[PDB]
Amino acid sequence: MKSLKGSRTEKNILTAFAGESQARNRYNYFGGQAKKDGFVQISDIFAETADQEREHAKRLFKFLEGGDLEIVAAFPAGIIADTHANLIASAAGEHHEYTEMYPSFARIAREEGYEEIARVFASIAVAEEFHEKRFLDFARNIKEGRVFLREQATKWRCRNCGYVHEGTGAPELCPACAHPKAHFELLGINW
Amino acid sequence: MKSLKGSRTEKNILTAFAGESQARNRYNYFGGQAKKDGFVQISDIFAETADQEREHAKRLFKFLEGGDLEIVAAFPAGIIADTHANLIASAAGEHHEYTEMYPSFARIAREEGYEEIARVFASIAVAEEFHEKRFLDFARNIKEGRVFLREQATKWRCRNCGYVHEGTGAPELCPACAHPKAHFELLGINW
Ligand SMILES: [Fe+3]
Ligand SMILES: [Fe+3]
Ligand SMILES: [Fe+3]
Ligand SMILES: [Fe+3]
Ligand SMILES: [Zn+2]
Ligand SMILES: [Zn+2]
């Protein structure tokens, strides 16, 4: 470290901040479309990813010490589509970020004496890979019609009321809260 | 209207989207700092303004029909300070936006045959003026020490539990929910 002011890293941070800020918005918009599309678990993961982008941007933004600063950079100009498409566009952009943008940025940060920032750019990359992974599995189940249907009987959980259900597919309506299949997910345990 | 692709308006929308996306983040960060600073009513108004920026950005973003698109533009590189400073930086940026950026953008939109977009840029400007107004009155009370103290006895409301209190100043603790003065605001009626 030292001072960012005038460095290339300084513009890289702002550019990342600008792209991650926009990603938060798009993921929130993508989450609202997934809810409309009937994918509540996917809606909440967009919303979760949005929130996690907010936190990536926050860490970066706190690096800056400065005033206004001009950046040249390209950004998706649109667009909000169907959920599958939203998930793939999201995946693609996460992809460029972790395979391209952040590795470079990291490099230069490193290569300007900003190794902490360097670490942070690499660390966010990790998150972005998982984000990608996640978006892709979900796109694939949507593609393979396996969101609400699996080939062996398994357990599904109602996200709305916690009702658990044994079967190959989620129910068309929660016996407990009477919410529709959209609220069902594969029951998972991570503790 | 017609098609945005290649227009100057197209880059203006993305640039606005990019600046408004960043504003959402900064206002959310500014809201978290106001909560820490002991200004809960001001925290929630940052959060409210953040949310309203999300909605300005959403309307704009929905205009785009496109792919990647390069923009040159300047953005605050930082910073998160004390609440007063956050409120003034916010005011300044809202100021530039409604007096400068959006009037121009509107003009060109107009002047490219995009009059609906034109209307939207002018309409957002209105919101941004109120946003400014709001931030400025709050900065002024913080400046004049009148956040939690007024010169005549008046009524204060606990934002946490609704408890209402008659006095020149808010109480140091809510008699009802036992939360601190930070949660108090001037009682208001807008219905
Ligand atoms: Fe990500
Ligand atoms: Fe249920
Ligand atoms: Fe505003
Ligand atoms: Fe109270
Ligand atoms: Zn991110
Ligand atoms: Zn706005």
Side-chain angles (χ1 to χ4, degrees):
Chain A
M1 203 121 131
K2 48 216 199 84
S3 154
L4 273 52
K5 272 319 207 170
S7 90
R8 329 187 38 206
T9 300
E10 174 176 42
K11 289 125 180 273
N12 289 343
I13 294 181
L14 179 59
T15 292
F17 176 74
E20 297 266 87
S21 292
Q22 300 178 52
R24 175 183 182 197
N25 264 344
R26 298 188 314 259
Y27 297 154
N28 270 132
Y29 313 153
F30 292 164
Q33 189 60 56
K35 190 82 78 231
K36 306 234 176 256
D37 279 340
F39 308 108
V40 167
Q41 185 195 186
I42 292 181
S43 187
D44 291 346
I45 277 114
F46 267 129
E48 190 196 80
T49 310
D51 284 347
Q52 289 179 340
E53 303 292 330
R54 163 194 78 216
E55 301 293 319
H56 296 160
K58 191 202 206 131
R59 185 86 195 277
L60 293 178
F61 185 80
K62 276 144 102 226
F63 272 116
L64 314 174
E65 66 222 2
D68 304 288
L69 175 135
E70 178 150 75
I71 62 199
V72 198
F75 299 109
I79 203 275
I80 306 170
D82 71 278
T83 284
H84 182 85
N86 294 333
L87 290 161
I88 296 304
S90 294
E94 298 269 6
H95 190 81
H96 174 265
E97 271 161 41
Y98 75 83
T99 60
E100 280 232 7
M101 211 208 72
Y102 279 122
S104 339
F105 282 5
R107 199 109 49 38
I108 295 163
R110 248 184 253 118
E111 184 206 304
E112 280 173 10
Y114 304 120
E115 234 277 311
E116 144 81 296
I117 292 178
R119 268 134 101 314
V120 167
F121 280 131
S123 293
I124 298 164
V126 162
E128 317 290 39
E129 185 166 14
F130 175 51
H131 287 162
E132 186 195 23
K133 260 47 161 160
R134 206 159 63 159
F135 282 141
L136 289 189
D137 298 338
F138 279 118
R140 181 142 28 263
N141 305 332
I142 286 168
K143 234 233 203 137
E144 266 151 49
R146 296 218 320 141
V147 172
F148 298 114
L149 192 26
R150 311 303 268 230
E151 281 79 34
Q152 0 286 343
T154 176
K155 0 234 227 167
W156 307 88
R157 196 195 57 136
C158 180
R159 302 198 70 239
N160 186 51
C161 77
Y163 171 77
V164 179
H165 169 84
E166 271 263 20
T168 40
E172 233 114 83
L173 212 91
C174 179
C177 73
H179 281 60
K181 167 153 52 187
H183 299 254
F184 276 94
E185 70 186 7
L186 274 175
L187 177 132
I189 305 313
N190 61 306
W191 48 78
Chain B
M1 203 121 131
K2 48 216 199 84
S3 154
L4 273 52
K5 272 319 207 170
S7 90
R8 329 187 38 206
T9 300
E10 174 176 42
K11 289 125 180 273
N12 289 343
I13 294 181
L14 179 59
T15 292
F17 176 74
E20 297 266 87
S21 292
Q22 300 178 52
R24 175 183 182 197
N25 264 344
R26 298 188 314 259
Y27 297 154
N28 270 132
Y29 313 153
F30 292 164
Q33 189 60 56
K35 190 82 78 231
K36 306 234 176 256
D37 279 340
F39 308 108
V40 167
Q41 185 195 186
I42 292 181
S43 187
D44 291 346
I45 277 114
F46 267 129
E48 190 196 80
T49 310
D51 284 347
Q52 289 179 340
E53 303 292 330
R54 163 194 78 216
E55 301 293 319
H56 296 160
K58 191 202 206 131
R59 185 86 195 277
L60 293 178
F61 185 80
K62 276 144 102 226
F63 272 116
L64 314 174
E65 66 222 2
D68 304 288
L69 175 135
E70 178 150 75
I71 62 199
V72 198
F75 299 109
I79 203 275
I80 306 170
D82 71 278
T83 284
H84 182 85
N86 294 333
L87 290 161
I88 296 304
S90 294
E94 298 269 6
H95 190 81
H96 174 265
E97 271 161 41
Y98 75 83
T99 60
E100 280 232 7
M101 211 208 72
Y102 279 122
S104 339
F105 282 5
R107 199 109 49 38
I108 295 163
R110 248 184 253 118
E111 184 206 304
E112 280 173 10
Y114 304 120
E115 234 277 311
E116 144 81 296
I117 292 178
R119 268 134 101 314
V120 167
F121 280 131
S123 293
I124 298 164
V126 162
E128 317 290 39
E129 185 166 14
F130 175 51
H131 287 162
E132 186 195 23
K133 260 47 161 160
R134 206 159 63 159
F135 282 141
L136 289 189
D137 298 338
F138 279 118
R140 181 142 28 263
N141 305 332
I142 286 168
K143 234 233 203 137
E144 266 151 49
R146 296 218 320 141
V147 172
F148 298 114
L149 192 26
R150 311 303 268 230
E151 281 79 34
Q152 0 286 343
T154 176
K155 0 234 227 167
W156 307 88
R157 196 195 57 136
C158 180
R159 302 198 70 239
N160 186 51
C161 77
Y163 171 77
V164 179
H165 169 84
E166 271 263 20
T168 40
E172 233 114 83
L173 212 91
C174 179
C177 73
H179 281 60
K181 167 153 52 187
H183 299 254
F184 276 94
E185 70 186 7
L186 274 175
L187 177 132
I189 305 313
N190 61 306
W191 48 78

